[PDB]
Amino acid sequence: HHHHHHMVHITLDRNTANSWLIISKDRRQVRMGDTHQNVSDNKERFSNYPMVLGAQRFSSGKMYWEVDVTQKEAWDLGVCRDSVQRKGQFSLSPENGFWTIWLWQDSYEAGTSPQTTLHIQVPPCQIGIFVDYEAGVVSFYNITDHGSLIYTFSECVFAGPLRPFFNVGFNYSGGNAAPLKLCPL
Numbered sequence: 156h157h158h159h160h161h162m163v164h165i166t167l168d169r170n171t172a173n174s175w176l177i178i179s180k181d182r183r184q185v186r187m188g189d190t191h192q193n194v195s196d197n198k199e200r201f202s203n204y205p206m207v208l209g210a211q212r213f214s215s216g217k218m219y220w221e222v223d224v225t226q227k228e229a230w231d232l233g234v235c236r237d238s239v240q241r242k243g244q245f246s247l248s249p250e251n252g253f254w255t256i257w258l259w260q261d262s263y264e265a266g267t268s269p270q271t272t273l274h275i276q277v278p279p280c281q282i283g284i285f286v287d288y289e290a291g292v293v294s295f296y297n298i299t300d301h302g303s304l305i306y307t308f309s310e311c312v313f314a315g316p317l318r319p320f321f322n323v324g325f326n327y328s329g330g331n332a333a334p335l336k337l338c339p340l
């Protein structure tokens with residue numbers, strides 16, 4: 156792909172984070188803490204899952220960023236509407252305002268309803284995410300495998316401003332403590 160020149164500097168929005176997340180001083184890394192991180196509750200925080208949003212809101216144009224997922228066993232990545240549900244249980248789907256892929260139990264899947272199996276021969280250590288607002292496209296790229304395409308959502312009905320979306324996943328296994336990191340331009 157040739158999307159690198161649409162690179163945007165994403166930072167994480169602390170106020171949206173699940174109360175167990177630890178976001179770095181530079182707001183570029185996030186991992187699961189082993190306890191509540193001593194913050195007040197608010198209506199923005201994701202309550203049920205270890206999720207956080209980017210601070211940036213996109214309503215036009217082409218945007219590209221990269222995320223490091225080295226040594227994680229589970230995570231979700233993509234974009235979502237600014238008005239997605241924060242509290243309680245929900246599935247990641249375009250009907251609920253999410254355009255995402257994930258790793259879970261040694262398989263990669265796109266967050267369609269129902270979910271779609273991905274075909275990845277080289278497990279990625281870094282993921283590239285491309286959004287074309289006007290075209291209604293969200294695409295995912297395998298940076299470890301020379302930028303190969305992972306998945307394209309097309310005919311997207313965003314129906315609102317978009318925010319970068321992250322889930323570091325639970326760490327029940329003791330093998331999923333590693334952070335998500337926003338990679339430099």
Ligand SMILES: Cc1cccc(C(=O)NCC(=O)O)c1
Pocket residue numbers: 332333334
């Ligand atoms: C305290 C702790 C435990 C496990 C992992 C980390 C972490 O930041 N990952 C390593 C890295 O910086 O690449 C921190």
